């Protein structure tokens, strides 16, 4: 009742990492699980959400699938004015049939664009792609920006164990720069090449493995020099920067030693320090981290203009979290950046 | 201006994560690399330090091997009063011949004890074990405490792809509580089950993979309920807690979710929150992170009684890091805890 839409408290609440699904894609996951082509991450994650009779899981599924009045109602009840929506991890990235991946990504994008068109003041879209086909992905990036009204794309970290620093994926970056839109690297379960010890302990998901997977992915992109190749490119990550801001001193110290060593072909001198890239090319949301000390730490390290509010609905739908964020010991100006104007700037809303 | 031993600035400087090597053990690593029994981590780490003609590597190795005049002079030049010493990672943990591992650990421990006897006001020992044989390792824990004057043990994370949460390793914990000593879990390269994507990018070492490996290891001990079984047990980690203090909100939220969902046999209800265990059973050093923002964050999160200074000599021997730590914006009282009195309490000096 005290969480209201309309911005009377001094800012709109724009939630920047909100998830949806389509039934057909989840049915592909089920099919892959049943036929033994699903990787261990898919079995762990979607084997649970798509099959568990638990209320928590079935409510998550229903909320993911809705792009209408239920979602709006859930937003209204937590004072969320606008939601930036993307197809839930891992999207079509694990699909081995490329016609099927492109087809289902196309349709998910059309489905999302339709919903944003119906609720243009509430729903904002990020496109989904199929990095198995970087050239098609580039066309979908352009199509999203030009025809669909999307504000960027979300990539669900690795694609079948392959990372975006590979030259093979270059067309994707080229297109984002052409349309001048950000890439949100959202987590996925680790590939089978890494997941085993986390899986055994129940640590492969959002508790830990998500952060490992996504942190590595962003770090690999930084150290390969993606922001020297593409100085205008902005990469967004959630979960308070997957710990990279906390690791920053160690990252710069060890990166400098690594470059000087000249051991690694893929670790050569960069034009900025890692800290520099965090301040100029990387952007962070607090998805999953409704925790003031970590938010302030990141605002201090990266700059208050570069840290944004996200709810991570429907996985983490908690009124008391929005309340804790509303009540942060932060100036009105800083708080308005965090909830509203940073997102409006960086996503060009 | 000089860095001086003696504590005239108001505290002694006690460095709590300092490494040494023995020639024979480095020689085993090389034999292992030559004959193809070394895992990819050992090839990456020691294949480099033990063979590279580069300055950083040659000096690291010379410094590791010295337990006398050079080490004392390096300490004196940086105003380090005492160093807590442990055999450098991975110690004898990778060795497949159990006789050889027990022999080399024994000899490493005796060598260390001899050095500590020779410089009793400068060197303090932590014992090395062979978790391949937990029952022997329990005996060696008792021996180090009873005969060698050691203050605890260092384990270099996994032992051949296995983690300490497995029931098999229980005698090690039983022994630590019997002698009432802390376990320092120091990093190692990830096992072959996890290392590939980090290895490709040059991120398997201290820049990132060390943090992934060690953070995962401590997290899996927390979630198996090691501190409910052994509530007196203290585990120390370096590198500002391997990001776990930064991740604390996410860990508690997602841990609660995992427990409630029953998805994981090895994630069952615990008596405290993860925050509770950080405040009562986990201890942190700033090894490799001479960076005031991270240090202060950690002090806030865990309590300033639970955060200690470490240099990580000789891997990170930097006079300006010591000066930066001396100059941090903290009360004199906090700074004395950080540099001296926390270590005195937790290692029982
Ligand atoms: C499948 O997508 C997600 C799943 C979960 C989870 O299972 O806890 C978390 C988030 N998240 O961003 O933390 C996700 O978006
Ligand atoms: C083999 O021992 C270590 C190696 C490195 C390194 O390669 O820089 C760093 C640390 N450390 O704990 O940060 C070590 O102790
Ligand atoms: Cl509307
Ligand atoms: Cl002495
Ligand atoms: Mn999410
Ligand atoms: Mn170390």
Structural domain tally of chain B? 1
* Cα A337–Cα A343–Cα A344 angle in degrees, nearest 5: 95
B115 is in which domain, residue-wise? 1-349
Question: CA of B259: which chain A residue's CA is closest?
Answer: A202
Ligand in nearest proximity to the CA of A123: 3
Q: Answer yes or no: are the C-beta atoms of A166 and A136 closer than 8 Å.
A: no
A103 CB contacts (<8 Å, ≥6 apart)? none
Centre of ligand 4 to C-alpha B321, Å, is 24
Q: List chain B residues with CB under 8 Å of A247.
A: 208, 211, 243
Give SS3 for A16: strand
Centre of ligand 5 to C-alpha A17, Å, is 6
Inspect the interface and report whether the beta carbons of A288 and B220 lie closer than 8 Å.
Answer: no
CB of A288 closer than 6 angstroms to any ligand 1 atom: yes
Centre of ligand 3 to C-alpha A87, Å, is 20
Tell me, what DSSP letter sits at residue A235? E
Give SS3 for A14: strand
> What is the C-alpha to C-alpha distance for residues A247 and B294, in angstroms, rounded to an integer?
8
The token duo for B118 is: 């020779």
CA dist list (Å): B178 to B51, B138, B165, B233, B349: 41, 10, 18, 10, 18
Cα B345 off chain centre by: 17
Inspect the interface and report whether the beta carbons of A201 and B165 lie closer than 8 Å.
Answer: yes
Residue nearest to atom 8 of ligand 1 (CA): A206
Write down how long chain A is. Answer: 349
> What is the C-alpha to C-alpha distance for residues B116 and B79, in angstroms, rounded to an integer?
19
* Cα B216–Cα B217–Cα B221 angle in degrees, nearest 5: 115
Residue that is written with structure tokens 């993911």 in the block? A64
Give SS3 for A266: coil
Q: Answer yes or no: are the C-beta atoms of B339 and B89 closer than 8 Å.
A: no
Q: Domain of B40: which CATH number? A: 3.20.20.140
Short-list B219, B290, B293, CA closest to B252: B219
> What is the C-alpha to C-alpha distance for residues A331 and A328, in angstroms, rounded to an integer?
9
Give the full edge-to-edge strand order of the sheet including A153-155.
A153-155, A183-185, A235-237, A282-285, A307-308
Q: List chain A residues with CB under 8 Å of B57.
A: 261
Q: Answer yes or no: are the C-beta atoms of A254 and B206 closer than 8 Å.
A: yes
At what resolution in Å was this solved? 1.8
Give the full edge-to-edge strand order of the sheet including B282-285.
B153-155, B183-185, B235-237, B282-285, B307-308
CA dist list (Å): B111 to A17, B128, B130, B326: 55, 11, 16, 32
CB-nearest to A207 from B158, B208, B255 is B255
Centre of ligand 1 to C-alpha A206, Å, is 6
Secondary structure, 3-state, chain B:
CCCCCCCCCCCCCEEEEEEECCHHHHHHHHHHHHHCCCCHHHHHHHHHHCCCCCHHHHHHHHHHHCCCHHHHHHHHHCCCCEEEEEECCCCCCCCCCHHHHHHHHHHHHHHHHHHHHHCCCCEEECECCCCCCHHHHHHHHHHHHHCCCCCCEEECCCECCECCCCHHHHHHHHHHHHHCCCEEECCCCCCCCCCHHHHHCCCCCCCCHHHHHHHHHHHHHHHHCHHHHCCCCCEEECHHHHCCCCCHHHHHHHHHHHHHHCCCCCCCCCCCCHHHHHHHCEEEECCCCCCHHHHHHHHHHHCHHHEECCCCCCCCCCHHHHHHHHCCCCCHHHHHHHHHHHHHHHCCC
Neighbours of A325 (CB within 10 A): 20
Q: List chain B residues with CB under 8 Å of A260.
A: 56
CB of B187 closer than 6 angstroms to any ligand 2 atom: yes
Rounded to 5 degrees, φ, ψ at B245 are -65, -35
Short-list A93, A21, A85, CA closest to A50: A21
For chain B, state the CA radius of gyration.
Answer: 19
> What is the C-alpha to C-alpha distance for residues B15 and B286, in angstroms, rounded to an integer?
10
A221 CB contacts (<8 Å, ≥6 apart)? A163, A164, A165, A235
Technique that determined the structure? X-ray
Q: Answer yes or no: are the C-beta atoms of B332 and B37 closer than 8 Å.
A: no
Handedness of CA A36, A37, A43, A47 (dihedral sign): negative
Which ligand 2 atom sits closest to the C-alpha of A254? Answer: 8
Neighbours of A3 (CB within 10 A): 16
Give SS3 for A182: coil
Cα A118 off chain centre by: 24
């Amino acid at each position: 009742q005290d969480l209201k839409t309309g911005g009377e408290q001094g800012y709109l609440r724009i939630a920047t990492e909100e998830a949806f699904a389509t039934r057909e894609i989840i049915d592909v996951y089920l099919r892959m699980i049943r036929d033994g082509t699903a990787d261990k991450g898919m079995v762990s994650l979607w084997g649970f959400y798509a099959q568990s009779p638990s209320e928590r899981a079935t409510q998550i599924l229903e909320r993911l699938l809705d792009l209408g009045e239920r979602r709006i109602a859930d937003m209204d009840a937590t004072g969320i004015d606008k939601a930036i929506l993307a197809l839930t991890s891992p999207g079509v990235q694990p699909l081995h049939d490329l016609d099927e991946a492109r087809t289902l990504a196309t349709r998910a994008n059309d489905t999302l664009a339709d919903a944003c068109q119906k609720y243009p003041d509430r729903f904002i879209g990020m496109g989904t792609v199929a990095p198995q086909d970087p050239e098609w992905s580039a066309r979908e990036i352009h199509r999203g920006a030009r025809e669909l009204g999307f504000k960027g794309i979300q990539i669900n970290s690795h694609t079948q164990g392959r990372y975006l620093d590979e030259e093979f994926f270059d067309p994707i970056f080229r297109a984002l720069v052409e349309v001048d839109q950000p890439l949100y690297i959202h987590p996925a379960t680790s590939p089978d090449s890494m997941i085993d010890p986390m899986l055994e302990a129940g640590l492969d998901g959002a508790i830990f493995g998500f952060g490992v997977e996504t942190g590595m992915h962003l770090l690999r992109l930084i150290t390969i020099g993606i922001f020297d190749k593409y100085p205008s490119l902005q990469i967004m990550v959630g979960h308070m920067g997957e710990a990279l801001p906390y690791w920053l001193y160690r990252l710069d110290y060890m990166h400098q030693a690594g470059v000087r060593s000249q051991r690694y072909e893929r670790m050569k001198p960069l034009k900025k320090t890692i800290e520099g890239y965090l301040k100029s090319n990387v952007l962070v949301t607090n998805s999953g981290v409704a925790w003031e000390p970590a938010i302030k730490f990141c605002q201090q390290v990266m700059g208050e203009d570069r840290v944004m509010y996200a709810m991570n609905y429907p996985y983490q739908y908690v009124a008391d979290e929005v309340r804790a964020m509303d009540a942060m010991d932060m100036s009105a100006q800083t708080k308005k950046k965090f909830f509203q104007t940073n997102a409006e700037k960086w996503f060009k809303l």
